[PDB]
Amino acid sequence: GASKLRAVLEKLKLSRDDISTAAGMVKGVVDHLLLRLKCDSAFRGVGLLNTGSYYEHVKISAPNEFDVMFKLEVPRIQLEEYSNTRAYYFVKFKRNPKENPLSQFLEGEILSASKMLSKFRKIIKEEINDIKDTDVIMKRKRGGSPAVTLLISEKISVDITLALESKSSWPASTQEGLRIQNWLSAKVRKQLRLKPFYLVPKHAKFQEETWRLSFSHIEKEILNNHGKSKTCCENKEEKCCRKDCLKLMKYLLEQLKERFKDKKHLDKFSSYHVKTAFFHVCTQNPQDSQWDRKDLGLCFDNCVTYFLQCLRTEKLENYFIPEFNLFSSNLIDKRSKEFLTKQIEYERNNEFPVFDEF
Ligand SMILES: [Zn+2]
């Protein structure tokens, strides 16, 4: 019941100070990398994007896995959607008056992601080896985003993502996304869509010089300012359980991944999937009275049941790009989704024995 869920949440709090100090090490390394990058003429105006709960810029997606985004203001953006994929784009430049600092990365009229990543990597691996003080290990990663994974000390690994910043209107593929009007209001949806959007070098399936839309800054804003009431969670009368439900869903997936590690059935699933499903459940349940702290058990069941539906139907829409299905067969194979469906179903039907202490 909810008492078991509350106990899980209390257990997770015991890790807080270890996370804070570990995020503190990520922070110091990143601050160092930022100042060196700014020396290169192409990465002049590089900066840290506000996406995380630690020091504005350090984000957790799983215990000991930290996430940091480097933003780069790139004016005159011009996007060309890569063949009906809705989330992947070629990057061109609207006009030519000044020759852009990223001229070096052009292959024709198109900004090369793999060219720009190579320099980004070269500069980082240059400073990572040019540090006597602390051993910091770079592992060139799977492809595109994240660009670099550093390994600090033993278990701390920070992913570092480069992101182009566009202050232009969001692409047409987002026009029916961010369906927050009945929850956070039409006024807020308008304000959020006036903010920049970001492009990360992720490559569509093998390769291409494509970039993927990213809204990590908006995700943080709507998790931290998450109520229909402006004063949700600002006083003792308005304590909702939205953040606790997302935490429990992330922990559920983390624990199942560890239990099913012998055959790695669940490798493709991520906290981003559970976060996306959670945002959809917020749209479905827009009133703060549907997230009363006393109803933690029912609220968590709402979240789990919707995630199960996404698995069984093999459909999880990106919250910002509705026609981008995170659970398509191109991204996650059918047998993986069928397998997780069965395990989530079992957990729900048995009151989550994966959360048992005995
Ligand atoms: Zn709240």
Side-chain angles (χ1 to χ4, degrees):
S3 75
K4 183 156 66 185
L5 301 182
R6 286 189 286 273
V8 168
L9 292 165
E10 291 300 313
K11 187 177 58 175
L12 297 173
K13 294 183 183 179
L14 292 168
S15 296
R16 270 170 178 188
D17 293 344
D18 291 14
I19 298 172
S20 69
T21 65
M25 297 270 284
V26 174
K27 186 57 188 167
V29 161
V30 148
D31 295 331
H32 181 353
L33 293 178
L34 184 64
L35 51 88
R36 155 77 156 99
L37 275 169
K38 295 174 175 179
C39 297
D40 187 283
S41 77
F43 301 113
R44 279 289 148 76
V46 73
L48 283 174
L49 182 60
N50 176 14
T51 64
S53 50
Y54 299 91
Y55 331 139
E56 259 194 278
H57 316 124
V58 183
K59 181 193 198 171
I60 320 175
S61 31
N64 293 315
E65 292 189 326
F66 290 91
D67 212 281
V68 166
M69 291 187 54
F70 288 12
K71 66 158 178 274
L72 192 52
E73 161 74 309
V74 178
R76 293 177 178 92
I77 214 55
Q78 179 85 22
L79 296 192
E80 172 181 322
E81 175 183 9
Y82 167 64
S83 64
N84 311 283
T85 64
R86 306 271 65 191
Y88 294 88
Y89 293 80
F90 301 112
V91 166
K92 302 173 175 185
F93 286 90
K94 179 182 177 182
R95 294 171 70 173
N96 190 61
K98 276 212 253 185
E99 155 137 286
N100 50 293
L102 309 178
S103 37
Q104 344 158 1
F105 310 122
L106 301 171
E107 301 201 63
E109 324 161 347
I110 272 171
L111 190 71
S112 175
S114 68
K115 292 314 174 254
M116 190 175 317
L117 278 181
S118 177
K119 217 184 189 186
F120 194 70
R121 291 200 188 88
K122 277 190 182 62
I123 299 171
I124 294 180
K125 211 225 169 188
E126 203 162 276
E127 299 282 294
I128 204 186
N129 88 62
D130 200 303
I131 270 202
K132 213 192 70 176
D133 348 66
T134 166
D135 113 285
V136 270
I137 282 159
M138 166 164 173
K139 190 181 197 67
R140 290 165 186 272
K141 273 291 295 173
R142 323 179 142 242
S145 289
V148 185
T149 290
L150 280 65
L151 185 55
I152 297 177
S153 301
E154 294 180 340
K155 297 168 183 286
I156 323 174
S157 93
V158 47
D159 290 1
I160 286 166
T161 296
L162 182 63
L164 308 184
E165 182 182 76
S166 179
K167 296 181 175 185
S168 302
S169 303
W170 294 12
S173 68
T174 69
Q175 256 168 36
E176 304 307 307
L178 194 60
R179 289 257 237 107
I180 65 177
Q181 299 93 324
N182 290 339
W183 163 29
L184 299 171
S185 80
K187 290 172 189 66
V188 165
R189 190 181 183 267
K190 285 186 181 58
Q191 301 164 17
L192 291 175
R193 300 188 84 250
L194 287 176
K195 292 186 169 207
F197 69 98
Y198 298 90
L199 296 146
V200 299
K202 182 119 139 213
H203 294 137
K205 36 266 124 184
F206 313 150
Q207 251 246 39
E208 211 59 83
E209 295 314 323
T210 48
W211 303 69
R212 181 163 153 164
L213 299 176
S214 174
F215 299 91
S216 302
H217 60 307
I218 305 300
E219 297 166 6
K220 175 189 173 169
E221 190 162 337
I222 70 178
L223 253 174
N224 285 340
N225 189 1
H226 58 243
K228 177 172 290 305
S229 174
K230 295 171 187 173
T231 47
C232 194
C233 291
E234 289 198 350
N235 58 66
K236 64 187 191 308
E237 290 82 21
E238 298 184 69
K239 285 314 208 166
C240 82
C241 66
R242 283 182 182 92
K243 281 191 178 181
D244 283 340
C245 282
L246 174 60
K247 286 189 179 62
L248 288 168
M249 291 287 301
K250 291 179 171 185
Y251 191 58
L252 173 60
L253 182 61
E254 288 173 11
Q255 288 297 292
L256 292 175
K257 288 173 78 178
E258 280 174 272
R259 295 228 169 159
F260 288 93
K261 73 190 196 177
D262 294 297
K263 301 191 183 189
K264 284 326 209 293
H265 312 274
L266 308 182
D267 282 4
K268 289 289 191 186
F269 297 102
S270 80
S271 63
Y272 192 68
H273 297 135
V274 141
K275 181 187 202 176
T276 297
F278 171 78
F279 285 149
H280 288 297
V281 175
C282 286
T283 296
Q284 295 181 16
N285 295 274
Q287 302 286 341
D288 298 338
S289 58
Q290 295 176 291
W291 298 93
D292 193 296
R293 192 166 186 280
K294 300 182 294 298
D295 296 326
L296 178 62
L298 184 54
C299 295
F300 182 60
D301 190 70
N302 290 342
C303 293
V304 170
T305 293
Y306 182 72
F307 192 63
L308 183 63
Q309 176 185 292
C310 295
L311 292 163
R312 197 187 307 275
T313 63
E314 305 179 65
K315 190 157 168 214
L316 174 56
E317 300 190 347
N318 178 294
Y319 198 65
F320 301 82
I321 310 162
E323 301 163 80
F324 184 51
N325 175 16
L326 305 182
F327 278 0
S328 70
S329 63
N330 195 38
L331 293 173
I332 306 174
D333 72 306
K334 186 167 188 42
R335 283 178 199 163
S336 295
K337 284 164 305 201
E338 297 184 337
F339 191 84
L340 184 53
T341 300
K342 184 117 186 318
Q343 319 313 325
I344 297 281
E345 186 177 58
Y346 168 83
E347 291 295 325
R348 185 203 178 201
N349 291 348
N350 291 96
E351 306 207 315
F352 302 94
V354 71
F355 289 162
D356 288 349
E357 286 297 311
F358 304 131

